Design a protein around this motif. Structure first.
Motif, PDB file in Angstrom:
ATOM      1  N   UNK A 110      -3.138  33.205  51.094  1.00 46.83           N
ATOM      2  CA  UNK A 110      -3.594  34.108  50.031  1.00 46.83           C
ATOM      3  C   UNK A 110      -2.159  34.593  49.142  1.00 46.83           C
ATOM      4  N   UNK A 156     -12.944  20.066  44.896  1.00 50.73           N
ATOM      5  CA  UNK A 156     -13.288  21.167  44.671  1.00 50.73           C
ATOM      6  C   UNK A 156     -13.719  22.151  45.850  1.00 50.73           C
ATOM      7  N   UNK A 198      -3.958  20.143  50.578  1.00 51.16           N
ATOM      8  CA  UNK A 198      -3.963  21.110  49.204  1.00 51.16           C
ATOM      9  C   UNK A 198      -4.962  20.923  48.125  1.00 51.16           C
ATOM     10  N   UNK A 199      -6.167  19.844  48.542  1.00 48.08           N
ATOM     11  CA  UNK A 199      -7.112  19.702  47.579  1.00 48.08           C
ATOM     12  C   UNK A 199      -6.893  19.034  46.208  1.00 48.08           C
ATOM     13  N   UNK A 200      -5.557  18.239  46.333  1.00 48.12           N
ATOM     14  CA  UNK A 200      -5.082  17.469  45.563  1.00 48.12           C
ATOM     15  C   UNK A 200      -5.452  16.204  45.826  1.00 48.12           C
ATOM     16  N   UNK A 201      -6.157  15.394  44.894  1.00 51.26           N
ATOM     17  CA  UNK A 201      -6.560  14.005  45.357  1.00 51.26           C
ATOM     18  C   UNK A 201      -5.842  12.941  44.346  1.00 51.26           C
ATOM     19  N   UNK A 202      -5.587  11.715  44.827  1.00 49.12           N
ATOM     20  CA  UNK A 202      -4.775  10.793  44.067  1.00 49.12           C
ATOM     21  C   UNK A 202      -5.539   9.554  44.206  1.00 49.12           C
ATOM     22  N   UNK A 203      -5.756   8.935  43.087  1.00 45.98           N
ATOM     23  CA  UNK A 203      -6.472   7.524  42.703  1.00 45.98           C
ATOM     24  C   UNK A 203      -5.478   6.336  43.172  1.00 45.98           C
ATOM     25  N   UNK A 226      -7.166   9.027  47.965  1.00 43.69           N
ATOM     26  CA  UNK A 226      -6.394   9.807  49.130  1.00 43.69           C
ATOM     27  C   UNK A 226      -6.686  11.357  48.662  1.00 43.69           C
ATOM     28  N   UNK A 285     -10.621  22.997  47.766  1.00 44.20           N
ATOM     29  CA  UNK A 285      -9.578  24.228  47.338  1.00 44.20           C
ATOM     30  C   UNK A 285     -10.226  25.668  47.458  1.00 44.20           C
ATOM     31  N   UNK A 288      -8.325  27.405  50.070  1.00 46.11           N
ATOM     32  CA  UNK A 288      -6.745  27.575  49.557  1.00 46.11           C
ATOM     33  C   UNK A 288      -6.544  28.559  48.575  1.00 46.11           C
ATOM     34  N   UNK A 289      -7.899  29.191  48.112  1.00 45.67           N
ATOM     35  CA  UNK A 289      -7.694  30.370  47.349  1.00 45.67           C
ATOM     36  C   UNK A 289      -8.217  31.747  47.972  1.00 45.67           C
ATOM     37  N   UNK A 290      -9.206  31.619  48.639  1.00 47.44           N
ATOM     38  CA  UNK A 290      -9.935  32.782  49.210  1.00 47.44           C
ATOM     39  C   UNK A 290      -9.666  32.735  50.700  1.00 47.44           C
ATOM     40  N   UNK A 291      -9.197  33.996  51.085  1.00 46.45           N
ATOM     41  CA  UNK A 291      -8.868  34.300  52.647  1.00 46.45           C
ATOM     42  C   UNK A 291     -10.185  34.449  53.452  1.00 46.45           C
TER      43      UNK A 291
END
Lengths: 136, 239, 240, 44, 232, 238
Positions: free
Chosen positions: F8, F111, F147-152, F143, F114, F117-120
């Motif tokens: 946070x 989603x 960090x909730x970032x997904x790559x095609x 993949x 994530x 990664x934003x709420x404690x």
């Protein structure tokens, strides 16, 4: 920035002759319009020339009441350029000394002193005006 | 001494709430200044309009918000917090109108906003909104009314007040003004506001650099003056 | 220091340092620009292809909030996706509660409140992405808005977010955006994106265009491949 | 039913008047009474 | 023992709740206020001195009514005062709804003290940084109480809180007699504030309320001016 | 520094250090590779055995008849995520009677991951997911990072020592589309073996394969089932 030097260069004599005729009014009105355009256009040279010309017509025409009112109004115009006011007041204080009638000179010097009151750029002109008033 | 300034609920040994004072300091972080003057039959707010970019849509840069058809507000401080407080005030006004039938007085608008701010001050859940609100409204049987609401939850009516970076100087100039008894006409009220802002800022005040909101007894509707009206008022002021 | 750990703490000089940290986190992202033409809005996003293994269009930063609203996110990508979901939900709720497409000004306001609500509590951190909302309609013209991590939103005639915001703004101010339709604004945007891109630092990149305007009937859609290729050719032809 | 409703409305309006320092309006009393009665679906 | 001055739910090794004492210090750093009970009623007076003429004196009133027969002034933080006023009014209305009789002054003081205590029994909530001086009239007898952020309420005959409260108390025990009247009470309270008031007592700089048999009424500025003229 | 204890807290450089530590947690797991042809999606994972006689840990999880994943990271987070996507696929098949497309499932995964990664209160999901799935838009190898970032990705590899596999995939990417199932699985096995040290080799006891194809549901091959793909593999030069 918009510039009016080319226009005012031929304007000033063609209204100077008609002012010398004596009716004024229209001359000072169109000079006021050009002064407004130049002042909103940041035309320090043209505003100074217009102010000098109009105070010169007032001085030649001996319209002392109109001269004082014009000095008041022009010095009180919205964001009037400092250089134009300085040149106008320089012309006025040069005109001051050749005035012979005491009340006319007194009114002119009081108007000049009050329009220059608390002004940095005309401090020495106001000092000379105060010296002249004290001498009178 | 200054080791007690990390939680808004912690009293300093001198009995001072330092986080609220820090929100007051954050009020000036917006970099602008707003002045409100209450005339004999009108109220006027003037705020700095600083658009330091030719790309911004100058319509949406406004810091003047219409809380209600008759109650207007000017915000100072962080823009996001100010807009949040604006929507909260609008919702409170709508709730008052729905629950009581008549329009909410500006008195109650600032009182409720200050109550919300105090609740945020006493319960360490939300950071206090570092936005100062100035509300103007024609309250019947009392004429024009100008009120100021702060992050501390202290709401107060004012004959004339100011907020922002140049708050002390504008308040001093107004204090010099409202003391010499004068006919506080609508034009006179706008004149006093613009003169305050110009004197404290030393700015020629081109019409696009300021925003003026007006409420009047004749028309008790929050009106934002167009640029032409601002120019007319400025040229009247100069002469 | 000390006044820096939580978004609910005010520094002695009066600023929320977590919000500013989020802003400068956005500053580290790749540039993305948005220009509202005479009759629409065009978004041009540079996307640094970190690995060649990614397929084309992966991690696309153009998001369709509604039928007529497009987004040009820049910053943390996961935060951008979450904010896109929030904006889509807000638009859907507005449609279901009022029966018509949400005005882009009101949608920008609501999403700005959602962003700002995350800069008040110590339990949650401010959003790490700053985005652009663009729309066009026959009754409201063309509108563009920019929302930063702080939640501040107002309309812009043309802007950039990311690494080279200032560099793109210098080349944006020199366009008479009030006049030309977006058909040419597309290649102008492509040229601006290609200029602001740093080939020696960001290595390869992919330019993604999108537009919403009268030429698109009002719906926000990705620019078709032909116009994208034409705009890329125009940008490449400006090497000198 | 009417006694308790009128007493509660009077207490709420007294609180409102104390918060405003002004004379209460009949519109407010009518509004509060109508919403309170409508919430109970005519069971009062 | 500075390490125990932060938590509201932690006893110091000397067994002192330091945060409540800090709230009381904030109370003592507030605007001076006096409250004195005479055989005819109670009088609560306070210094409503603004920082400038710009502030509207009549916008906000420090002395506020709770019921027809109960009034209440304060010393300390301003915004918390409004919350306490609202809770006191709500408690009075609840008591009236339950019992159909106006709430006795002692009962209202007890309930308000409990309300103030509710904010001192948990972390993350701050005690009410204000002290309340409450006047009431029941059973043909004046009643004056002082509720504190600690939730402790007493039955002051005559007292002063806020800035220079020691000076106000010292002025009292001299000009105070238990057999006075409401007019003498008004005069004594105004003088006591004068012992701690900087500047001329403009009628708009002082707020006075009287809790007499007819109920609680805040004095209009005309009556304040008349009393000030009778005093000065 | 002092900004390193919470997800946070923003660092003054604009980074979330707990997010980066969650990413670091991925490389604690063994290397896994995923790659798609024009008709099939195949992911091969290297299984780790904690003892000489203990079974090798399951590395490829079954999600739905058309979606299967490989895990690299925390076992708890991997299991929780697998349960979540199993429930999502089951709900999609119950409501629409249609298999959930891989892209929507990966968006839901992003989603969901994530939120921590934003709420404690909850740490970020410390696991990288290689999601292989066939839908009406062709095979997909996504993949998902902590960090909730997904790559095609056309072909990806995550976990310990996976950079060599990524280089191999980058080099041999151009040939993946026009490859039959066996050729694709052999390319995946070569990519996996690139991560292995010199002494280690891909045996049938430490390799797990997952294939989802045009007419083939997601099938997991372990132990002897790996042997048909393992046989015929060119020996590593030395």
């Amino acid at each position: 920035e918009v510039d009016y030097s080319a226009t005012v260069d031929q304007r000033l004599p063609e209204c100077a002759k008609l002012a010398k005729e004596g009716r004024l009014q229209e001359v000072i009105e169109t000079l006021l319009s050009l002064e407004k355009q130049t002042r909103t256009a940041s035309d320090m040279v043209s505003t100074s020339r217009i102010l000098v010309a109009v105070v010169k017509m007032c001085y030649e025409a001996k319209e002392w009441d109109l001269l004082n009112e014009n000095i008041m109004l022009l010095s009180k115009r919205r964001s009037q350029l400092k250089q134009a006011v300085a040149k106008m007041v320089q012309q006025c204080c040069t005109y001051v000394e050749e005035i012979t009638d005491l009340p006319i000179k007194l009114r002119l010097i009081d108007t000049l002193r009050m329009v220059t009151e608390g002004k940095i750029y005309v401090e020495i002109e106001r000092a000379r005006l105060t010296k002249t008033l004290a001498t009178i | 001494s200054a080791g007690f300034d990390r939680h808004i609920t912690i009293f300093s040994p001198e009995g001072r709430l330092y986080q609220v004072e820090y929100a007051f300091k954050a009020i000036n972080q917006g970099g602008l200044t707003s002045v409100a003057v209450r005339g004999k039959d009108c109220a006027v707010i003037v705020t700095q309009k600083k658009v330091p970019d030719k790309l911004l849509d100058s319509s949406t840069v406004t810091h003047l918000f219409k809380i209600t058809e008759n109650i207007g507000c000017v915000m100072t401080g962080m823009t996001a917090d100010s807009r949040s407080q604006v929507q909260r005030a609008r919702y409170e006004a709508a709730n008052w109108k729905y629950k009581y039938g008549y329009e909410i007085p500006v008195d109650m608008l600032c009182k409720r906003i200050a109550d919300i701010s105090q609740v945020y001050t006493q319960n360490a859940e939300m950071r206090p909104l570092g936005c100062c609100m100035i509300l103007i409204g024609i309250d019947e049987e009392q004429g024009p009314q100008v009120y100021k609401c702060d992050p501390a939850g202290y709401y107060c009516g004012f004959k004339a007040t100011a907020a922002g970076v140049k708050q002390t100087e504008s308040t001093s100039f107004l204090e010099k003004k409202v003391k010499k008894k004068f006919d506080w006409t609508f034009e006179q009220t706008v004149e006093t506001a613009i003169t305050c802002l110009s004197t404290v800022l030393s700015i020629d005040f081109k019409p696009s650099e300021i925003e003026v909101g007006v409420v009047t007894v004749e028309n008790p509707k929050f009106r934002i003056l167009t640029e032409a009206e601002i120019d007319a008022h400025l040229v009247a002021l100069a002469e | 220091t000390g006044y820096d750990l939580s978004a609910s703490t005010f520094s002695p000089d009066g600023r929320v340092f977590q919000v500013e940290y989020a802003m400068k986190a956005v500053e580290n992202s790749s540039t993305a620009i948005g220009i509202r033409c005479k009759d629409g809005v065009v978004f041009g996003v540079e996307k640094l292809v970190l690995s060649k293994l990614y397929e084309e269009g992966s991690n696309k930063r153009l998001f369709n909030v509604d039928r007529h609203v497009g987004m040009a996110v820049a910053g943390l990508l996961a935060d951008a996706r979450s904010l896109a979901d929030i904006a889509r939900e807000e638009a859907s709720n507005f449609r279901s509660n009022f029966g018509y497409n949400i005005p882009l000004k009101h949608l920008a306001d609501r999403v700005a409140m959602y962003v700002h609500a995350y800069t008040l509590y110590s339990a949650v951190r401010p959003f790490g992405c700053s985005f652009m909302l663009g729309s066009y309609s026959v009754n409201d013209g063309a509108q563009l808005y920019m929302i930063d991590p702080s939640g501040v939103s107002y309309g812009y005639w043309g802007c950039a977010i990311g690494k080279a915001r200032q560099a793109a703004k210098t080349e944006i101010e020199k366009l008479q955006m009030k006049e030309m339709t977006c058909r040419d604004i597309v290649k102008e945007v492509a040229k601006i994106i290609y200029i602001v891109h740093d080939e020696v630092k960001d290595k390869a990149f992919e330019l993604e265009l999108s537009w919403v305007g009268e030429l698109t009937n009002g719906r926000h859609e990705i620019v078709p491949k032909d116009i994208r290729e034409e705009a890329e050719k125009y940008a490449k032809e400006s090497l000198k | 039913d009417t006694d308790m409703t009128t007493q509660l409305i009077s207490s709420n309006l007294e609180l409102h008047s104390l918060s405003t320092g002004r004379l209460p309006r009949v519109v407010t009393a009518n509004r509060m009474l109508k919403q309170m009665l409508f919430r109970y679906q005519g069971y009062i | 023992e500075r390490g125990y001055s932060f938590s509201l739910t932690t006893f110091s090794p000397s067994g002192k709740l330091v945060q409540i004492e800090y709230a009381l210090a904030a109370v003592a750093g507030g605007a001076p206020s006096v409250g004195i009970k005479a055989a005819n009623g109670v009088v609560l007076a306070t210094e409503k001195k603004q920082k400038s003429i710009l502030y509207d004196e009549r916008s906000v009133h420090k002395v506020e009514p709770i019921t027809k027969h109960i009034g209440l002034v304060y010393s300390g933080m301003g915004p918390d005062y409004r919350v306490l006023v609202h809770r006191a009014r709500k408690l009075a209305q609840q008591y009236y709804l339950v019992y159909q009789e106006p709430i006795p002054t002692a009962q209202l003081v007890q309930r308000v003290a409990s309300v103030m205590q509710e904010y001192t029994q948990s972390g993350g909530v701050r005690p009410f940084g204000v002290s309340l001086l409450i006047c009431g009239w029941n059973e043909g007898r004046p009643y004056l109480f002082q509720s504190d952020p600690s939730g402790a309420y007493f039955a002051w005959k005559a007292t002063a809180m806020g800035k220079n409260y020691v000076n106000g108390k010292t002025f009292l025990e001299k000009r105070y007699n238990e057999d006075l009247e409401l007019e003498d009470a008004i005069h004594t309270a105004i003088l006591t504030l004068k012992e701690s008031f900087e500047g001329q007592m403009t009628e708009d700089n002082i707020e006075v309320g009287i809790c007499n048999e007819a109920g609680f009424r805040r004095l209009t500025p005309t009556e304040v001016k008349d009393y000030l003229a009778a005093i000065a | 520094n002092q900004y390193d204890n919470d997800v946070t807290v923003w660092s003054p450089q604009g980074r979330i250090h707990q997010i980066e530590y969650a990413m670091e947690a991925v490389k604690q797991g063994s290397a896994t590779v995923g790659l798609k042809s024009k008709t099939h999606a195949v992911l091969v994972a290297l299984k780790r055995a904690q003892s000489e006689l203990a079974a090798h840990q399951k590395k490829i999880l079954h999600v739905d008849n058309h979606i299967g994943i490989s895990i690299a990271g925390l076992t708890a987070d991997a299991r929780l995520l697998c349960n979540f996507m199993r429930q999502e696929c089951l709900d999609s098949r119950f409501v629409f009677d249609r298999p959930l497309p891989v892209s929507r499932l990966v968006s839901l995964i992003g989603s969901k991951t994530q939120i921590p990664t934003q709420r404690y209160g909850r740490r970020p999901y410390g696991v990288g997911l290689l999601i292989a799935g066939y839908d009406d838009m062709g095979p997909h190898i996504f993949q998902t990072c902590p960090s909730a970032n997904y790559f095609d990705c056309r072909a990806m590899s995550i976990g310990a020592r996976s950079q060599s596999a990524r280089t191999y995939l980058e080099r041999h990417m151009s040939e993946f589309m026009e490859c039959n199932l066996n050729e694709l699985v052999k390319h995946g096995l070569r990519a996996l073996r690139e991560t292995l040290p010199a002494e280690q080799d891909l045996t049938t006891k430490n390799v797990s394969i997952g294939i989802v194809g045009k007419d083939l549901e997601f099938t997991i091959y372990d132990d002897d089932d790996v042997s048909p793909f393992l046989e015929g593999l060119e020996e590593r030069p030395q």
